Each structure stands twice: as C-alpha cells, then as structure tokens.
C-alpha cells in the first residue's frame, strides 16, 4: 500500500478520488528515495544557503522583556528570501518535481504568499507554474498577483463556491488529476493527503534544527517553550519537529481567535472545530452542524486555512503540544510592540505567536523562562491593513 504511515494516531490519511492515488504513491516513493540521496540533500542545502539565505538569525530581544524574568529569542524566518518561511519547502518540492521528471507546477494560494513562493521557485528552477486563486482573494491581493506574474507564473482565478482558499484547493486537485504525468502539485502547508503533511514538515524542519543549535550556542540550554502560529501548520511543525523528543521543551501552537472564540468568527479548528474529512485528510476543521465546510476568519490572511495539519491534532491529543488562541486585537498590539521596541515589523500571522509570548511574560512577570518565538515572516505586506484599522480607531 504505502511506504510510510499516512496516519498520525487517528488523523491524516489519503481521502482522495481513486484517480489521484497513483500520483500520491509516485510522490511518496520519490520523496523516500530523495531523502536517502546525498546528492539531493546537497542540492537542497545549497539552494537554502546560497539562494534563500539560511541559516537565519536567532535574535535576542533587548527591550521588549524589560522588567520581567523572561528571555525572548526570535527565529528570523522574516530574513528568508521572499520574507516568509514558505520559501524553504517550495524549493524542496520544486527539486522533487525535477527529480520526478515533471516540468509543470500547480499551486493554490489565498493571501498570495504561497503563490509568490511557488512562482519564484518555479522561475529559478525552470518550471512552468500555474496558480489557482479565489477571485475574492485575487481582488484583495493584487500586489501579490503582480509579483507572481512578474515571475512568469500563470494566475487563474476561481469563482467556484465562496471563491477563497478552500475553493482554490479544490480546482488545483481537479487539474492535477488530469495532469500529474507532467505536473507536480505544490501544496502550501503541512496538511492535505499523505504524503504532503510529512513532506512539508521534512522540508521545513531545518527551522527547529537551527534553533536548537543556535540556542545551545547562546544560552547553553534548551528553551522552556517554543511558540509558533498555526494556520495550516507548516511553520509550527517545522519549528517543533526537532524538539518533539526533548520532552522538557514546551511546544505551543497559536491559532487565530479572530474577534473572539465566543463570537464564532475565528480560525481555530484544532481547539474549537470538529473532526471531519476534507482536502484529503481526517482532521479538525471549521464546519457547520450539517457537515458543510466554513471559512476561517482572521485579521491575518495567512491563517485563513479552515483546517489544520493532522500531526498537530495528533500532538495535541497525546498532550505533547498545547494549542491556544490569540484575537485580532491581541495580535495587533503585539505587532505595534515589536515595531516600537525592537525595530522589526512582523507579519500579522507571526504577531499571533508573539502576542502569546507577551501574555506568558506579562501574566507572570517574575517567572524565569526562556522562550523562542518563530517569527515566520516580515510585516511589510501588512502595513496597509494595520494603517487602515488604526485610522478607523483613532
């Protein structure tokens, strides 16, 4: 059947139309052999080092923790080429596509960051790239659409359904069912049918590997907790993976709380959704009582995925990792604080992680604790959104 386990406990699987199963089996086999292939590993490491900018810095915050016993470090995936952690895994997947003899790339995108990342990896490696985007998201992210077009990607708007990310996830699958002979489906997060939750984790796991070596170098000990926001789960599982067996290290994922869990307008499926089956996996998701799939809501477009990676649902169930939520307002405050005190503009996505670290520090200011936040991207893309909200308030 498969070479690797498609399930994490009870979550995961390969819930796709029969016609896509050979494509997933081909992909899993190519991934397993790429992972045992020193030549592939060296090409991948070469691209990450000399093209994307790895290793990224681990910055000790100077000012933000003043008057507490917290020491806060930031893993600076905002300094990665493209400005977000997504770049790591699209380079790996593009090298995989070439290894399989594929020449075309399919990708879905909502906020546009995965579409930009897939377009730049495709231009670098000589792959023709077509990108599906919900027409609601096309209208609202015309900067990112221009970027993709500058990089030679074909952008295709989706009006099906609610014309957002989830409906882009569907039309990419339809395309790939016909075109997988020559096309690779470059999924954007650590979710979907096996083997994608495993692949995206392994192509993001250097975040945690570097963090561990960097924190041991600087502080001589492992952190008390590493904290990362969770839209689909790729940046969080990439930070977590190398600490999973270090059972003294807290693992904290932060889901978007939106206007508040109690309002119903949030994007926290792991803690406040319900297990269902969609997008090729059994996982917690945003759904109605009838079993229809809703959208997440968050101020940060990048946490818009209405489900969550199945390895996260597994880690939660066994108690290895804890998951919390942070509202729009808490994230906005963290955005402003990092700007004013450290001179770093964080992505509104990453600001949810930082906001929870600030909560831990402020609620117990005499607790000694060593925290690492995964700063998954930079916030230049969010300054217009933040500006308008702050004008509308005063």
């Amino acid at each position: 059947t498969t070479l690797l386990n498609p399930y994490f406990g009870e979550f995961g699987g390969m819930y796709v139309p029969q016609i896509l199963m050979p494509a997933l089996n081909q992909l899993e086999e190519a991934f397993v052999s790429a992972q045992k292939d020193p030549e592939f590993q060296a090409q991948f490491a070469d691209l990450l080092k000399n093209y994307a900018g790895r290793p990224t810095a681990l910055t000790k915050c100077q000012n933000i923790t003043a008057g507490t016993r917290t020491t806060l470090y930031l893993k600076r995936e905002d300094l990665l080429h493209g400005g977000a952690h997504k770049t790591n895994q699209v380079l790996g997947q593009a090298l995989l596509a070439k290894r399989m003899g594929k020449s075309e790339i399919i990708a879905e995108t909502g906020a546009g960051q995965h579409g930009v990342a897939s377009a730049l990896a495709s231009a670098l490696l000589g792959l023709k790239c077509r990108i599906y985007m919900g027409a609601k998201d096309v209208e609202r992210q015309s900067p990112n659409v221009f970027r993709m077009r500058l990089m030679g990607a074909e952008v295709i708007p989706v009006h099906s359904g609610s014309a957002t990310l989830k409906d882009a996830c569907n039309e990419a699958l339809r395309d790939w069912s016909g075109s997988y002979e020559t096309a690779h489906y470059m999924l954007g997060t650590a979710a979907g049918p096996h083997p994608y939750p495993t692949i995206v984790r392994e192509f993001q796991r250097m975040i945690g590997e570097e963090t561990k070596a960097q924190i041991l170098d600087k502080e001589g000990r492992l952190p008390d907790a590493v904290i990362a926001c969770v839209g689909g789960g790729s940046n969080a599982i990439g930070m977590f993976a190398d600490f999973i067996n270090d059972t003294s290290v807290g693992l904290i994922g932060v889901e978007p709380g939106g206007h508040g869990i109690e309002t119903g307008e949030h994007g926290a499926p792991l803690k406040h959704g319900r297990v269902g089956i969609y997008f090729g996996m059994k996982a917690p998701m945003m759904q109605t009582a009838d079993g229809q799939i809703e959208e997440s809501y968050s101020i940060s477009a990048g946490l818009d995925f209405p489900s969550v990676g199945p390895q996260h649902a597994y880690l939660n169930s066994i108690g290895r990792a804890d998951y919390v939520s942070i509202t729009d307002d808490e994230a906005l405050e963290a955005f402003k604080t990092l700007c004013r005190h450290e001179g770093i503009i964080p992505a509104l996505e990453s600001s949810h992680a930082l906001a929870h670290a600030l909560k831990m520090m402020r609620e117990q200011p005499e607790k000694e604790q060593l925290l690492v936040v995964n700063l998954s991207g930079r916030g230049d893309k969010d300054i217009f959104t933040v500006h308008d909200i702050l004008k509308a308030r005063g």
Binding site: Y15, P17, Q18, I19, M21, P22, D167, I277, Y278, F279
Partner: protein, 256 residues
C-alpha cells in the same frame, strides 16, 4: 431488496443496457427537482444516481459545482435530501437509487448512522467520491451491515491490484471511468466484479450503444442531464420536455 440484481436480470432477458441519469437533489428547487426526477423515471431511466449538495465537491467539474450552488441557494440541506429520498422511494418502489456522497457528509453524524438512514429511506447504493478503496474499510463495512451496496470507481489509470480490490469490495455495479476499454470490462468479469456501467462523457445516444456493445451493462450520464437543467432554468416546462426527449432517446439507444 436487491433492486440492482432484479434490474440487471430483466435488462439482460430483454437484451438492453441500463441508462442511469445523474442529477443533484434539490436543483434548482426542492419541488422542481422532485418533478425532474419523476420525469426522468417516466421517460425510461432504469435507475437513478443522486447527488447530495456539498460545499467542497473536489471530484466534480463545473457543471456539478454550479448544480450544488443552485441547490444551496434553494436552502437544500442533507436532512431535506433524505426527506426527498423517502418520497421518491414511496412513489417508485422498484427503481434502484444510488447516492453520490462526499466523505464528510457520511462521516459527520457517524458512518454507521448515515448508512442506517439510507437503509431506512430505501437507498440501494452509496458511492463516496473521495474515499479510495485503500481507505474504504469502515465505509463498506458499515454499508454491508445495513444492506447498502458500496460503489467504487474504476479509473482509466487502474492497475491490476486495483481491479481485484474493486471486484471484491464493490456491489450493485462498478462505476467505469472511460488501458483499452474492452480489456477493462473483460478483466472485471474475469474477477466477477459487479456489472460495469460506463460513466465517462456519455452525452449522445451513440455513446450509450457503444458502451453496451463494448460489454458494459449500461451507461451513466454524469452531467449531460444537469446541463439541460442549466440551459432551461428560466423555462421549467421547456426543461421537462427537453429532459423527456433526451432520456427517451438515450434509453432507446440501450436497446441493442
């Protein structure tokens, strides 16, 4: 009840193939849908394949995506579909009725509970579009426990191990998507699979005749019927007359 065995037994003594229209339940309204289905049967459909509107039908093309949107606009819910299924079955005791489902609607209130409810309203078979045979065990076990036939799609890219799983696991009929066609039918009857219905791009009477002559027990028109509904949304009476003319023409073609 074994409606499929009875259907095929009579069809074979009359050397006919089966003609099976697909239609989305509640498209474009609940009452108009109920009249569309009564027209399809009366014009000669041998069985029915019915979709329950789902938010994210990732295995469907645009014609069915729009059919779901029309039904959602009409307020159709899974519960209202089951109410409709009980009515249809009350009017038409012998026609086989198959459901095309997505896994989340089957999983939502419990897999076993879903198949119990199908048995209650008299549904004969269930195809779950996004459950491959490799993941099917809890679905087909629940189906068999409630006397429901689990339907599996045999795709064009099928290898031999898939044919053996499809032949052992399926009941009622095999859903054929378009390796030479004639060879697929022969391997399937070699492995004693449920009778194969060809279901890829069946649009004209000539395609129905080709499928039967090629060894398939019949044909499913998977979207040509929904196109007729889409074409004629403004004129309900022209909609039913076009549906009547098309279905009787397609069903005449199955008489080889």
């Amino acid at each position: 009840m074994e409606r499929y065995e009875n259907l095929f037994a009579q069809l074979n003594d009359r050397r006919e193939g089966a003609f099976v229209p697909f239609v989305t339940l509640g498209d474009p309204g609940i009452e108009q849908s109920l009249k569309i289905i009564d027209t399809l049967i009366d014009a000669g459909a041998d069985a029915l394949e019915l979709g329950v509107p789902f938010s994210d039908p990732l295995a469907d093309g645009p014609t069915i995506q729009n059919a779901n949107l029309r039904a959602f606009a009409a307020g159709v819910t899974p519960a209202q579909c089951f109410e409709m299924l009980a009515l249809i079955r009350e009017k038409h005791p012998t026609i086989p009725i198959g459901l095309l489902m997505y896994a989340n609607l089957v999983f939502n209130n419990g897999i076993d509970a879903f198949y119990a409810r199908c048995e209650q309203v008299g549904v004969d078979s269930v195809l779950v579009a996004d459950v491959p045979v490799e993941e099917s065990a809890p679905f087909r076990q629940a189906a068999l426990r409630h006397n429901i036939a689990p339907i599996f799609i045999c795709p064009p890219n099928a290898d031999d191990d898939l044919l053996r799983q499809v032949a052992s696991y399926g009941r009622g009929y095999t859903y054929l998507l378009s390796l030479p066609l004639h060879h697929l039918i022969e391997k399937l009857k070699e492995y004693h699979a449920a009778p194969a219905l060809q279901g890829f791009g069946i649009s004209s009477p000539e395609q129905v005749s080709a499928a039967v002559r090629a060894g398939a027990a019949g044909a499913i028109s998977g979207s040509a019927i929904v196109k007729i509904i889409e074409k004629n949304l403004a004129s309900p009476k022209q909609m039913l007359a076009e549906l009547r003319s098309f279905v009787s023409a397609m069903k005449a073609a199955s008489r080889a």
